[PDB]
Structure formats: C-alpha cells, structure tokens
Nucleic acid binder design. Structure first.
Ligand SMILES: [Zn+2]
Ligand SMILES: [Zn+2]
Ligand SMILES: [Zn+2]
Length: 89
DNA sequence: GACGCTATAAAAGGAG
DNA sequence: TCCTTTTATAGCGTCC
C-alpha cells in the first residue's frame, strides 16, 4: 500500500506513508505543540516551524537568492521571492 | 508588490 | 521500526 497510515478524523482522512508523519498530523487536530522556543517560550506543532521561528530571534537568514543574492530567513520566502525577477508589476 | 512568519505536508537521515 | 531532522508548499497579515 502506498500510504498505509490514515487519519482517524473522518472529516479529514488524509493519508501518509510514514507513521511519524501521521502522528505529526494528528497534532493539528489535538492542538498539541511539543516544540518549545527557549527564548520566548512559545510552542510549535513541528520542529520545522520552531526552527524557522528561532531565526526571528537570532536574525539568521540562511536562504539566499541566486539572481540578486538577497537573504531570507525561510525557504518559502526565498523561493517565492525569486519569481519576481521573471515578471514585471 | 513584496515579504515576514506560522502551518502544514512530505521526504529523508540515522540508529538499533 | 522509531525517532530526529530536513525540504516543500499554502496562506495570513502588513507595510509599501
Ligand atoms: Zn486529520
Ligand atoms: Zn521564541
Ligand atoms: Zn532576488
């Protein structure tokens, strides 16, 4: 089976191949946020979101644009940005 | 128009 | 496999 682990909430019913990913997903239903920022004590649903968040404190911007070389704290922001060099206003 | 930021999904790494 | 960590995608909010 491609994606064995199914979500128990009948409304959702999203599928995952890895069990961790299902557990992480069920958390959006339970509202459990096990990842805590040790600076402001805010809780996050994922390690990824906590890590992206820690950068807002440290000011680190590890994502650079290939075209203009401008820096960004997150991958999405960087990727979405790159698309402005391909069009006008 | 742009982008800072959180959410969420999906994949991958590593150890036993 | 279980658990950790990384990579990809979707909006919201706000200032310009
Ligand atoms: Zn669900
Ligand atoms: Zn914090
Ligand atoms: Zn650029």
């Amino acid at each position: 089976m491609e994606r064995p682990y199914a979500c128990p909430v009948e409304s959702c019913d999203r599928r995952f191949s890895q069990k961790t990913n299902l557990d992480t997903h069920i958390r959006i239903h339970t509202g459990q946020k096990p990842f805590q920022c040790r600076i402001c004590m805010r809780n996050f649903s994922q390690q990824a979101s906590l890590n992206a968040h820690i950068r807002t404190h440290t000011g680190e911007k590890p994502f650079a644009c290939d075209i203009c070389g401008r820096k960004f704290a997150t991958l999405h922001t960087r990727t979405r940005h790159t698309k402005i060099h391909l069009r006008q206003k």
